[PDB]
Amino acid sequence: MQSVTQLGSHVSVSEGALVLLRCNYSSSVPPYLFWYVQYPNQGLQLLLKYTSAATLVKGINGFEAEFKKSETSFHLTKPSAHMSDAAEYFCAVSESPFGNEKLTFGTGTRLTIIPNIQNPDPAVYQLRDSKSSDKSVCLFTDFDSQTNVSQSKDSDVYITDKCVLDMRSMDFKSNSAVAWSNKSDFACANAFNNSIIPEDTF
Amino acid sequence: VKVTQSSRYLVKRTGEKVFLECVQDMDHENMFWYRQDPGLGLRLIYFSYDVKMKEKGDIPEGYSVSREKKERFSLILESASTNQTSMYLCASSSTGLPYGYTFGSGTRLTVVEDLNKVFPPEVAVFEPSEAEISHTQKATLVCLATGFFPDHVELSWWVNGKEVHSGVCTDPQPLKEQPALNDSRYSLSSRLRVSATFWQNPRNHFRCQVQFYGLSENDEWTQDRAKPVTQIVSAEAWGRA
């Protein structure tokens, strides 16, 4: 258990595609390895671990890791990425099976999954609730993974990056970004700007 | 089987001395304190292998620890600096048993030098575009927690008394309402989508819930506005045709 490194702090992959997260270690004693995942809200959760037995360790949520002594490696794979897998993953190493022994962790690998958008129809809509006030809100939505948003060039106009949602009972997914300003001179027909697709509806 | 930590968020002035409490009911010999920081993984500050017994980890500079009963591992920061702003994670384990480490859920510590200029979020909710309902037959409501600091909110959606995950997306990082301002406030957006009928039925109840973690009872407030304690600020709406 001396050190651990995780080459690649960020991995994005399409839903359905192969997931692979590097972990490599140095140890002057026989190593005990672990993979942990950390989901948005929750604390560290053990995915799998290598004790001095099986070389190919099956973990939870369809994950697997091969311990390779020859290369000082313990890479985490799953052949088919799922949206639920988005998360940060951490390789760790110990000198003993004894819980006694301290874990030294890698730097972490952020996993991002890109949704396969079956039937895209990009639209920029407006929504002005009449409840409180300042209702000046523009939803860019139903667009395709390939498309990207750049944060606004004007200071009074707030824009959030794209976000993926899942309406599980219709097996339907959608990307959305949001735009807004208290500026009376602000309109949704031009709230968003960069690399916007010709067929966008209004 | 629960390692529990004092609290989950915390706001503290540069120079203050700070007590982080980690407790466990499991009768464990070993307790560890790590900090976690975007890009540097988890780094061990201090550990302890029995009552009264401590040891430096890889990064103890600036920290001191206290193991005083078997169950509790308090972490002390002598003089809170902005770069002790971190997620602090406690863990516990048994020497004999094979189950390894159990982790607490964490505590996020933000140190700022400011007249505790922490603000609770204001929360606005935005009814669906009529356009979307006609073109897509789905309806996206949007929520907006605005005017908060530090970055300490947990935004959930509630329908007819039950919290709902299916249909939601919240930004993972908030945006600076004023990027230039060193200790600027943040905003954060979330979206909730359902079928059009579910929205064009006035029996259906739609609330945006936002939990803010600011000040506790120990902290002192004299300013001429409500004390920005840990609270929940919400907005609501109903189905409609």
Numbering used by the authors:
A (entry chain A): 0 to 201
B (entry chain B): 2 to 242
Q: What did the study's authors say about this model?
A:
The key molecular interface that enables T-cells to sense these threats is mediated by the clonally expressed T cell receptor (TCR) that classically distinguishes between self and foreign peptides. The TCR governs T-cell specificity by discriminating between self and foreign peptides presented by MHC molecules. One key feature that is likely to facilitate this level of cross-reactivity is flexibility within the TCR complementarity-determining region loops (CDR loops) that form the antigen contact zone. The finger-like CDR loops of the TCR are thought to meld around specific pMHCs, sampling the peptide cargo, and enabling T-cell triggering by ligands with sufficient affinity/dwell-time.
We generated 12 structures of the F11 TCR, that recognizes a peptide from the influenza hemagglutinin protein (PKYVKQNTLKLAT) presented by HLA-DR*0101 (DR1-PKY), between 1.58 and 1.89 Å resolutions; 5 structures of the DR1-PKY specific HA1.7 TCR, between 2.31 and 2.98 Å resolution; and five structures of the 003 TCR, that recognizes an HIV-GAG-derived peptide (SLYNTVATL) presented by HLA-A*0201 (A2-SLY), between 1.26 and 1.37 Å resolution. For the HA1.7 TCR, we observed a larger shift in potential positions for the Cα backbone of the CDR3α loop, differing by up to 5 Å. In both cases, these shifts were comparable to loop movements reported in several other studies in which the unbound and pMHC-bound TCRs were compared. In contrast, the HA1.7 TCR structures, in which a large loop movement was observed, were solved at 2.5 Å average resolution. However, there was clear density supporting both conformations in the HA1.7 TCR structures. Similarly, the HA1.7 TCR CDR3α loop was free from crystal lattice contacts and shifted between structures. However, several other loops in both the F11 and HA1.7 TCR structures were also free from crystal lattice contacts and did not shift between structures. However, we observed several CDR loop re-organizations between structures for the HA1.7 and F11 TCRs, while all structures of the 003 TCR were identical at the level of the Cα backbone. Thus, we conclude that these loop movements represent real differences in the conformation of the CDR loops of the HA1.7 and F11 TCRs due to the intrinsic flexibility of these regions. Although this analysis is an approximation and should be treated as such, the average maximal loop motion was slightly less (6.4 Å) for the 003 TCR compared to F11 (8.7 Å) and HA1.7 (9.0 Å), consistent with the structural data demonstrating greater rigidity in the 003 TCR.
